[PDB]
Amino acid sequence: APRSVDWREKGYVTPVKNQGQCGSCWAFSATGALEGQMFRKTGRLISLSEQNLVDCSGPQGNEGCNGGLMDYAFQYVQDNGGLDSEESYPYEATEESCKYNPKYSVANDTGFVDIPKQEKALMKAVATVGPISVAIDAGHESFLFYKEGIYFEPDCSSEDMDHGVLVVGYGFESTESDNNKYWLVKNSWGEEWGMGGYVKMAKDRRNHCGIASAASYPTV
Ligand SMILES: *[C@@](O)(C(=O)NC1CC1)[C@H](C[C@@H]1CCCNC1=O)NC(=O)[C@H](CC1CCCCC1)NC(=O)c1cc2ccccc2o1
């Protein structure tokens, strides 16, 4: 695998979005991964509707603004046969009745791949597939007010890796000594947060300390 990957440079990633006050991080992570795979398949980058997921993926197990899983969202898209565009089904940060319309569907998926719980497996997937849906620990004040640099998770891999985000690549900044690698992560808290909406997560830190707990991506 190459030592640096950035799928943004290949046109895989839509501009950073803002989920507002709605527990819909899972929907933004899912739309980001599906946007990447749809682009790889078709060469067209089309922003997809998180509101569609929030309103309609209840039968697959999600609970709208009260949380959900990216895998359940991929399953909804597969069962539903489509997903509306962001433009056709805009985001409101509150759950409404399902308004899906197949006429405005712009995306599809045929299931999903769960990546094994290993840093090397995640790195291979990122290097070869595209942006990858993952869950990270976003609870600390140091993350809420993150602006620049490599972010180091305090409490290793504790049992609330609870925030769905999108890994769009990885890299390193070799300084004095240690390479100091990082995952490039797209968040859903707007352009104003972090590095234009992105965060560099510390990478290859130590075994049992990661970001590979719930990595997956849709098949198209
Ligand atoms: C996101 O981190 C998020 O939207 N955060 C912004 C509000 C600040 C949510 C937050 C979560 C949900 C809202 C209520 N309180 C919360 O802490 N996190 C999730 O949705 C989380 C993501 C998954 C991703 C894959 C690994 C496990 C975690 N999912 C849930 O919290 C969840 C999932 C689920 C499935 C069925 C029924 C309920 C349910 O909740």
Give the domain 5-218 fold.
Cathepsin B; Chain A (3.90.70)
Q: Which residues line ligand 1 (CB under 6 A)?
A: 19, 23-26, 61-63, 66-70, 135, 162-164, 214
CA dist 66 and 141 (Å) reads 21
Residue type, 37: Q
Q: Is 122 helix (H, G, I), strand (E, B) or coil?
A: helix
CA dist 145 and 33 (Å) reads 25
Q: Annotation-wise, does 96 bind a ligand? A: yes
CA dist 57 and 27 (Å) reads 10
Expressed in Å, this structure's resolution amounts to 2.0
Return the HEC string of 35-55: HHHHHHHHCCCCCECHHHHHH
Which tokens is 177 given?
A: 């000594």
CA dist 41 and 118 (Å) reads 27
According to DSSP, the residues that pair with 206 across neighbouring strands are 209
Residue 144 neighbours by CB under 8 Å, 6+ apart: 138
- Give 214 Cα–ligand 1 centroid separation in angstroms: 12
**Helical residues (DSSP H) of the chain, grouped into ranges:** 25-42, 50-56, 70-80, 119-128, 141-144
CA 159 to chain centre: 19
Which tokens is 8 given?
A: 């943004």
Radius of gyration of the chain (CA): 16
Method: X-ray
